[PDB]
Ligand binder design. Structure first.
Ligand SMILES: [Cl-]
Ligand SMILES: [Cl-]
Ligand SMILES: [Cl-]
Ligand SMILES: [Cl-]
Ligand SMILES: [Cl-]
Ligand SMILES: [Cl-]
Lengths: 117, 117
């Protein structure tokens, strides 16, 4: 169903793997945030990988969305990880210290290994 | 009154000039945001300068607060400006493209000149 699948994802072993295939920025940030909350977080799915392989850059609005997800998941005691940030994105994650407060993995298999234990 | 003045500010000609004298980051971000909304934005003060002279660095949480203020002010048709970011802060503002969507001034007199016209 289209709205259920407004952005690409799959659920593997109670983990929601989000795979946006386009830029996450001011134009789509609120739409994406509302979708993650409505489809997953507000329905009790609080283990989420945000896969960034196809995200060219992030801006302050996409960072605000990441922060909002992180806050929700930290509050409920779930698991949040950023996966495969490119170099431009990783530079932003570093300079804003987000890499000190959220797990970041190079690959999905690495993230899966952590969430299992 | 202490809670009214939980952080340093002054109101000059219908402009709220916020002058945090310490770091704005994950530890104080929500407290600061709630204070700006409760004291100013929710009371109809939508012309705000966030003066950054004494803010050593910003993180993803303080950026999220800036974004939330910006969103509120853009929605209500007010005026928002960042004033006197240091080099570390300006690098974050640049790399996250915030400098493309919010006015940034070196000094308070420059900002005042814009808000007048
Ligand atoms: Cl949003
Ligand atoms: Cl928005
Ligand atoms: Cl929402
Ligand atoms: Cl907040
Ligand atoms: Cl918070
Ligand atoms: Cl608030």
């Amino acid at each position: 169903h289209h709205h259920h699948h407004m952005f690409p994802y799959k659920i593997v072993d109670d983990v929601v793997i989000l795979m946006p295939n386009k830029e996450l920025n001011i134009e789509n940030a609120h739409l994406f945030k509302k979708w993650v909350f409505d489809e997953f977080l507000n329905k009790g799915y609080n283990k989420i990988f945000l896969v960034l392989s196809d995200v060219e850059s992030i801006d302050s609005f996409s960072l605000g969305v990441i922060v909002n997800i992180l806050k929700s998941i930290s509050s409920s005691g779930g698991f949040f990880a950023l996966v495969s940030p490119n170099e431009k994105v990783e530079r932003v994650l570093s300079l804003t210290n987000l890499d000190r407060i959220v797990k970041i993995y190079d690959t999905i298999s690495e993230a899966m290994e952590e969430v299992r234990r």
